[PDB]
């Protein structure tokens, strides 16, 4: 499920198109998971051992990120294709 189903669900998503003209397009290309990491109150990432999750009543979970390509046309094909990494 992690290796195949997640990436396939992402790629099978219809690319979102938005219109007022300004024609915005969104696409999701690549996926990442870090190791199971606990973010403290101050946002300090630390490797979370499962026994901590038992003891501290935390959910033993890993963050998930996606590379997102946003391509905006502006009625005249001046395409700005930005990419956001590890979103």
């Amino acid at each position: 499920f992690i290796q195949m189903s997640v990436q396939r669900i992402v790629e099978d998503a219809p690319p979102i198109d938005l219109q007022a003209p300004p024609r915005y397009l969104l696409k999701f290309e690549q996926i990442y998971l870090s190791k199971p990491t606990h973010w403290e109150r101050d946002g300090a990432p630390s490797p979370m051992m499962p026994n901590e999750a038992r003891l501290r009543n935390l959910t033993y979970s890993a963050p998930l990120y996606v590379d997102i390509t946003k391509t905006v046309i502006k009625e005249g094909e001046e395409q700005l294709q930005t990419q956001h990494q590890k979103t």
Binding site: I2, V6, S34, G43, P45, P47, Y65, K86
Partner: peptide, 16 residues
Amino acid sequence: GVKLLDISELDMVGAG
């Protein structure tokens, strides 16, 4: 296939 990241490539954006 899904790539893996190490903990050092996690920017501190979750704190901001």
